[PDB]
Amino acid sequence: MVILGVGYFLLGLILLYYGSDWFVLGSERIARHFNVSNFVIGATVMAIGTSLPEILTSAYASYMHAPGISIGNAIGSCICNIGLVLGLSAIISPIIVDKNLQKNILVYLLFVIFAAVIGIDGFSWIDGVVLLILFIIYLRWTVKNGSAEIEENNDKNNPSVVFSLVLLIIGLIGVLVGAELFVDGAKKIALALDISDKVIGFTLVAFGTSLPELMVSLAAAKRNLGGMVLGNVIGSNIADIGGALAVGSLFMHLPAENVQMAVLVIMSLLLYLFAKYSKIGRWQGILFLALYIIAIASLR
Numbered sequence: 001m002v003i004l005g006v007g008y009f010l011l012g013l014i015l016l017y018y019g020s021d022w023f024v025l026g027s028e029r030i031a032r033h034f035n036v037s038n039f040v041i042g043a044t045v046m047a048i049g050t051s052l053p054e055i056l057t058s059a060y061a062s063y064m065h066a067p068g069i070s071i072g073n074a075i076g077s078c079i080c081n082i083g084l085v086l087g088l089s090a091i092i093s094p095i096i097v098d099k100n101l102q103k104n105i106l107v108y109l110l111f112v113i114f115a116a117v118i119g120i121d122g123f124s125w126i127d128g129v130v131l132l133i134l135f136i137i138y139l140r141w142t143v144k145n146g147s148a149e150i151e152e153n154n155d156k157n158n159p160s161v162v163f164s165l166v167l168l169i170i171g172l173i174g175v176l177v178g179a180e181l182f183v184d185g186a187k188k189i190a191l192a193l194d195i196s197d198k199v200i201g202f203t204l205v206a207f208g209t210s211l212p213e214l215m216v217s218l219a220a221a222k223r224n225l226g227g228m229v230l231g232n233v234i235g236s237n238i239a240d241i242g243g244a245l246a247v248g249s250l251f252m253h254l255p256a257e258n259v260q261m262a263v264l265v266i267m268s269l270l271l272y273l274f275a276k277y278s279k280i281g282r283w284q285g286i287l288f289l290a291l292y293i294i295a296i297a298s299l300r
Protein backbone atom coordinates (compact mmCIF):
# COMPACT_ATOMS: atom_id res chain seq x y z
CA MET A 1 0.00 0.00 0.00
CA VAL A 2 2.93 2.33 0.70
CA ILE A 3 4.12 1.69 -2.86
CA LEU A 4 0.86 2.73 -4.49
CA GLY A 5 0.81 5.68 -2.10
CA VAL A 6 4.30 6.86 -3.09
CA GLY A 7 3.29 6.42 -6.73
CA TYR A 8 0.15 8.52 -6.37
CA PHE A 9 2.05 11.15 -4.41
CA LEU A 10 4.83 11.61 -6.96
CA LEU A 11 2.51 11.47 -9.97
CA GLY A 12 0.30 14.08 -8.29
CA LEU A 13 3.24 16.45 -7.84
CA ILE A 14 4.18 15.96 -11.49
CA LEU A 15 0.64 16.64 -12.75
CA LEU A 16 0.32 19.63 -10.45
CA TYR A 17 3.61 21.05 -11.72
CA TYR A 18 3.06 20.73 -15.47
CA GLY A 19 -0.72 21.00 -15.31
CA SER A 20 -0.54 24.35 -13.51
CA ASP A 21 1.71 25.82 -16.19
CA TRP A 22 -0.43 24.50 -19.07
CA PHE A 23 -3.52 25.91 -17.38
CA VAL A 24 -1.85 29.31 -17.03
CA LEU A 25 -0.57 29.26 -20.62
CA GLY A 26 -3.93 28.22 -22.06
CA SER A 27 -5.76 30.78 -19.91
CA GLU A 28 -3.45 33.64 -20.92
CA ARG A 29 -3.85 32.79 -24.60
CA ILE A 30 -7.63 32.54 -24.19
CA ALA A 31 -7.61 35.99 -22.54
CA ARG A 32 -5.76 37.38 -25.57
CA HIS A 33 -8.12 35.56 -27.96
CA PHE A 34 -11.25 37.08 -26.41
CA ASN A 35 -9.89 40.56 -25.69
CA VAL A 36 -10.12 40.35 -21.90
CA SER A 37 -7.46 41.08 -19.29
CA ASN A 38 -5.50 38.46 -17.38
CA PHE A 39 -7.33 39.56 -14.24
CA VAL A 40 -10.66 38.72 -15.83
CA ILE A 41 -9.59 35.27 -16.99
CA GLY A 42 -8.03 34.68 -13.55
CA ALA A 43 -11.13 35.82 -11.64
CA THR A 44 -13.56 33.81 -13.74
CA VAL A 45 -12.26 30.74 -15.60
CA MET A 46 -9.22 30.02 -13.46
CA ALA A 47 -10.78 30.93 -10.10
CA ILE A 48 -13.85 28.76 -10.64
CA GLY A 49 -11.82 25.89 -12.08
CA THR A 50 -9.50 25.79 -9.09
CA SER A 51 -12.35 26.27 -6.58
CA LEU A 52 -14.28 23.22 -7.80
CA PRO A 53 -12.67 21.12 -5.03
CA GLU A 54 -13.80 23.54 -2.28
CA ILE A 55 -17.29 23.67 -3.72
CA LEU A 56 -17.64 19.87 -3.93
CA THR A 57 -16.05 19.42 -0.50
CA SER A 58 -18.30 21.99 1.16
CA ALA A 59 -21.40 20.46 -0.45
CA TYR A 60 -20.36 16.97 0.67
CA ALA A 61 -19.40 18.00 4.20
CA SER A 62 -22.69 19.83 4.83
CA TYR A 63 -24.72 16.99 3.32
CA MET A 64 -22.84 14.66 5.69
CA HIS A 65 -24.02 16.73 8.67
CA ALA A 66 -20.64 18.42 9.15
CA PRO A 67 -21.44 22.11 8.44
CA GLY A 68 -18.52 23.24 10.59
CA ILE A 69 -16.08 21.61 8.19
CA SER A 70 -18.04 23.08 5.30
CA ILE A 71 -17.63 26.70 6.40
CA GLY A 72 -14.24 26.15 8.05
CA ASN A 73 -12.74 24.85 4.81
CA ALA A 74 -14.30 27.60 2.70
CA ILE A 75 -13.09 30.50 4.84
CA GLY A 76 -9.81 28.72 5.58
CA SER A 77 -9.29 28.66 1.81
CA CYS A 78 -9.79 32.43 1.57
CA ILE A 79 -7.19 33.08 4.26
CA CYS A 80 -4.82 30.71 2.49
CA ASN A 81 -5.33 32.44 -0.87
CA ILE A 82 -4.40 35.86 0.48
CA GLY A 83 -1.88 34.77 3.10
CA LEU A 84 0.10 31.97 1.48
CA VAL A 85 -0.76 32.04 -2.21
CA LEU A 86 -0.67 35.80 -2.78
CA GLY A 87 2.13 36.14 -0.21
CA LEU A 88 4.43 33.79 -2.13
CA SER A 89 3.35 35.19 -5.51
CA ALA A 90 3.90 38.84 -4.52
CA ILE A 91 7.56 38.19 -3.68
CA ILE A 92 8.20 36.27 -6.92
CA SER A 93 6.52 38.93 -9.06
CA PRO A 94 5.57 42.25 -7.39
CA ILE A 95 2.21 43.55 -8.54
CA ILE A 96 1.24 47.10 -9.35
CA VAL A 97 -2.55 47.39 -9.49
CA ASP A 98 -4.15 49.72 -12.05
CA LYS A 99 -7.26 51.81 -11.32
CA ASN A 100 -9.81 49.38 -12.80
CA LEU A 101 -8.46 46.45 -10.82
CA GLN A 102 -8.42 48.58 -7.64
CA LYS A 103 -12.14 49.12 -8.17
CA ASN A 104 -12.67 45.38 -8.49
CA ILE A 105 -10.73 44.67 -5.27
CA LEU A 106 -12.84 47.29 -3.48
CA VAL A 107 -16.01 45.50 -4.59
CA TYR A 108 -14.45 42.25 -3.38
CA LEU A 109 -13.87 43.93 0.00
CA LEU A 110 -17.54 44.99 0.21
CA PHE A 111 -18.58 41.44 -0.61
CA VAL A 112 -16.46 39.95 2.18
CA ILE A 113 -17.65 42.53 4.70
CA PHE A 114 -21.23 41.81 3.65
CA ALA A 115 -20.75 38.05 4.13
CA ALA A 116 -19.11 38.59 7.53
CA VAL A 117 -22.01 40.76 8.67
CA ILE A 118 -24.83 38.44 7.60
CA GLY A 119 -22.95 35.44 8.98
CA ILE A 120 -22.52 36.77 12.52
CA ASP A 121 -25.15 34.26 13.66
CA GLY A 122 -24.16 31.67 11.05
CA PHE A 123 -25.45 31.17 7.50
CA SER A 124 -28.86 29.89 6.39
CA TRP A 125 -29.82 28.64 2.93
CA ILE A 126 -31.24 32.10 2.25
CA ASP A 127 -27.88 33.73 3.03
CA GLY A 128 -26.44 31.24 0.55
CA VAL A 129 -28.87 32.15 -2.23
CA VAL A 130 -28.06 35.82 -1.68
CA LEU A 131 -24.29 35.22 -1.71
CA LEU A 132 -24.63 33.07 -4.84
CA ILE A 133 -26.52 35.82 -6.67
CA LEU A 134 -23.86 38.38 -5.69
CA PHE A 135 -21.23 35.90 -6.91
CA ILE A 136 -22.95 35.85 -10.31
CA ILE A 137 -23.31 39.63 -10.44
CA TYR A 138 -19.64 40.05 -9.55
CA LEU A 139 -18.59 37.76 -12.41
CA ARG A 140 -20.64 39.55 -15.07
CA TRP A 141 -19.63 42.96 -13.79
CA THR A 142 -15.97 41.84 -13.81
CA VAL A 143 -16.20 40.49 -17.35
CA LYS A 144 -17.93 43.60 -18.67
CA ASN A 145 -15.39 46.01 -17.12
CA GLY A 146 -12.35 43.99 -18.18
CA SER A 147 -13.37 43.23 -21.76
CA ALA A 148 -12.64 45.49 -24.69
CA GLU A 149 -13.93 42.83 -27.05
CA ILE A 150 -15.04 44.57 -30.17
CA GLU A 151 -15.11 41.62 -32.62
CA GLU A 152 -17.22 38.53 -33.46
CA ASN A 153 -16.15 34.87 -33.45
CA ASN A 154 -15.58 35.19 -37.20
CA ASP A 155 -12.78 37.69 -36.51
CA LYS A 156 -10.66 35.25 -34.49
CA ASN A 157 -8.04 32.67 -35.37
CA ASN A 158 -10.41 29.85 -34.45
CA PRO A 159 -8.00 26.94 -34.89
CA SER A 160 -5.61 28.81 -32.57
CA VAL A 161 -8.48 29.31 -30.09
CA VAL A 162 -9.05 25.56 -30.18
CA PHE A 163 -5.42 24.81 -29.34
CA SER A 164 -5.48 27.31 -26.46
CA LEU A 165 -8.75 25.88 -25.12
CA VAL A 166 -7.42 22.32 -25.20
CA LEU A 167 -4.23 23.43 -23.46
CA LEU A 168 -6.41 25.09 -20.82
CA ILE A 169 -8.64 22.04 -20.33
CA ILE A 170 -5.76 19.55 -20.13
CA GLY A 171 -3.97 21.92 -17.77
CA LEU A 172 -7.02 22.07 -15.49
CA ILE A 173 -7.44 18.28 -15.66
CA GLY A 174 -3.81 18.01 -14.62
CA VAL A 175 -4.09 20.24 -11.55
CA LEU A 176 -7.37 18.79 -10.24
CA VAL A 177 -6.37 15.13 -10.76
CA GLY A 178 -2.88 15.97 -9.50
CA ALA A 179 -4.28 17.52 -6.32
CA GLU A 180 -6.42 14.44 -5.69
CA LEU A 181 -3.54 12.02 -6.37
CA PHE A 182 -1.47 14.06 -3.91
CA VAL A 183 -4.08 13.77 -1.17
CA ASP A 184 -4.86 10.10 -1.77
CA GLY A 185 -1.18 9.20 -2.07
CA ALA A 186 -0.34 10.97 1.19
CA LYS A 187 -3.34 9.31 2.90
CA LYS A 188 -2.17 5.88 1.73
CA ILE A 189 1.36 6.59 2.95
CA ALA A 190 0.08 7.77 6.34
CA LEU A 191 -2.20 4.71 6.57
CA ALA A 192 0.64 2.35 5.62
CA LEU A 193 2.85 3.93 8.30
CA ASP A 194 0.00 3.62 10.80
CA ILE A 195 0.23 7.36 11.58
CA SER A 196 -3.09 8.37 10.08
CA ASP A 197 -5.57 10.19 12.28
CA LYS A 198 -8.50 12.54 11.71
CA VAL A 199 -6.29 15.59 12.35
CA ILE A 200 -3.80 14.59 9.64
CA GLY A 201 -6.69 13.50 7.41
CA PHE A 202 -8.57 16.75 7.43
CA THR A 203 -5.38 18.76 7.20
CA LEU A 204 -4.50 16.78 4.08
CA VAL A 205 -7.91 17.37 2.55
CA ALA A 206 -8.00 21.08 3.44
CA PHE A 207 -4.58 21.64 1.91
CA GLY A 208 -5.45 19.45 -1.06
CA THR A 209 -8.37 21.68 -2.00
CA SER A 210 -5.97 24.66 -1.98
CA LEU A 211 -3.18 23.06 -4.06
CA PRO A 212 -4.72 24.08 -7.42
CA GLU A 213 -4.83 27.83 -6.54
CA LEU A 214 -1.35 27.54 -5.06
CA MET A 215 0.35 25.90 -8.05
CA VAL A 216 -1.53 27.89 -10.68
CA SER A 217 -0.76 31.25 -9.05
CA LEU A 218 2.89 30.33 -8.54
CA ALA A 219 3.05 29.30 -12.20
CA ALA A 220 1.45 32.62 -13.15
CA ALA A 221 3.84 34.56 -10.90
CA LYS A 222 6.95 32.97 -12.46
CA ARG A 223 5.67 34.14 -15.85
CA ASN A 224 5.21 37.63 -14.37
CA LEU A 225 1.43 37.61 -14.85
CA GLY A 226 0.50 39.62 -11.76
CA GLY A 227 -2.97 40.48 -12.98
CA MET A 228 -3.68 36.80 -13.46
CA VAL A 229 -2.34 36.03 -9.97
CA LEU A 230 -4.51 38.74 -8.42
CA GLY A 231 -7.58 37.66 -10.40
CA ASN A 232 -7.12 34.07 -9.26
CA VAL A 233 -6.91 35.11 -5.61
CA ILE A 234 -9.84 37.55 -5.59
CA GLY A 235 -12.02 35.34 -7.78
CA SER A 236 -11.22 32.21 -5.75
CA ASN A 237 -12.23 33.87 -2.48
CA ILE A 238 -15.54 35.01 -3.96
CA ALA A 239 -16.12 31.57 -5.45
CA ASP A 240 -15.27 30.10 -2.04
CA ILE A 241 -17.84 32.33 -0.32
CA GLY A 242 -20.45 32.88 -3.01
CA GLY A 243 -19.97 29.30 -4.17
CA ALA A 244 -18.52 26.83 -1.66
CA LEU A 245 -19.88 28.38 1.53
CA ALA A 246 -23.23 29.21 -0.08
CA VAL A 247 -23.80 25.71 -1.43
CA GLY A 248 -22.94 24.26 1.99
CA SER A 249 -25.62 26.47 3.55
CA LEU A 250 -28.17 24.96 1.16
CA PHE A 251 -27.88 21.55 2.86
CA MET A 252 -27.56 22.73 6.44
CA HIS A 253 -27.33 25.86 8.58
CA LEU A 254 -23.65 26.75 8.87
CA PRO A 255 -22.26 27.72 12.29
CA ALA A 256 -20.81 31.22 12.64
CA GLU A 257 -17.06 31.60 12.15
CA ASN A 258 -16.63 35.11 13.46
CA VAL A 259 -12.94 34.77 14.31
CA GLN A 260 -11.97 33.48 10.86
CA MET A 261 -14.25 36.01 9.14
CA ALA A 262 -12.58 38.83 11.09
CA VAL A 263 -9.17 37.58 9.98
CA LEU A 264 -10.35 37.42 6.37
CA VAL A 265 -11.82 40.93 6.53
CA ILE A 266 -8.56 42.36 7.93
CA MET A 267 -6.42 40.61 5.32
CA SER A 268 -8.82 41.73 2.60
CA LEU A 269 -8.67 45.34 3.81
CA LEU A 270 -4.87 45.10 3.85
CA LEU A 271 -4.90 43.74 0.32
CA TYR A 272 -7.10 46.62 -0.86
CA LEU A 273 -5.01 49.28 0.88
CA PHE A 274 -1.81 47.88 -0.67
CA ALA A 275 -3.40 47.68 -4.13
CA LYS A 276 -4.85 51.19 -3.85
CA TYR A 277 -1.98 53.13 -2.27
CA SER A 278 1.21 51.06 -2.68
CA LYS A 279 1.93 47.75 -4.42
CA ILE A 280 1.72 44.05 -3.69
CA GLY A 281 5.44 43.25 -3.61
CA ARG A 282 8.16 41.83 -1.36
CA TRP A 283 7.23 43.21 2.07
CA GLN A 284 3.52 43.09 1.47
CA GLY A 285 4.07 39.41 0.59
CA ILE A 286 6.25 38.97 3.68
CA LEU A 287 3.48 40.48 5.81
CA PHE A 288 0.82 38.23 4.24
CA LEU A 289 3.02 35.18 4.88
CA ALA A 290 3.60 36.21 8.52
CA LEU A 291 -0.16 36.63 9.01
CA TYR A 292 -0.76 33.20 7.44
CA ILE A 293 1.78 31.57 9.77
CA ILE A 294 0.19 33.22 12.81
CA ALA A 295 -3.21 32.03 11.52
CA ILE A 296 -2.25 28.37 11.06
CA ALA A 297 -0.55 28.41 14.47
CA SER A 298 -3.47 29.89 16.42
CA LEU A 299 -6.77 29.25 14.62
CA ARG A 300 -8.81 26.27 15.81
Ligand SMILES: CCCCCCCCCCCCCCC
Binds near residue numbers: 186187189190
Ligand atom coordinates in the same frame (compact mmCIF):
# COMPACT_ATOMS: atom_id res chain seq x y z
C1 LIG B 1 9.94 18.45 -3.88
C2 LIG B 1 9.24 17.23 -3.29
C3 LIG B 1 10.16 16.65 -2.22
C4 LIG B 1 9.47 15.45 -1.59
C5 LIG B 1 10.38 14.94 -0.48
C6 LIG B 1 9.68 13.76 0.18
C7 LIG B 1 10.51 13.30 1.37
C8 LIG B 1 9.75 12.19 2.07
C9 LIG B 1 8.39 12.82 2.37
C10 LIG B 1 7.45 11.88 3.13
C11 LIG B 1 6.11 12.61 3.18
C12 LIG B 1 5.02 11.84 3.94
C13 LIG B 1 3.73 12.67 3.76
C14 LIG B 1 2.56 12.06 4.54
C15 LIG B 1 2.95 12.13 6.02
Ligand code: NA
Binds near residue numbers: 046047050052232
Ligand atom coordinates in the same frame (compact mmCIF):
# COMPACT_ATOMS: atom_id res chain seq x y z
NA1 NA C 1 -10.23 28.82 -7.07
Ligand code: NA
Binds near residue numbers: 053209210
Ligand atom coordinates in the same frame (compact mmCIF):
# COMPACT_ATOMS: atom_id res chain seq x y z
NA1 NA D 1 -9.15 25.19 -4.70
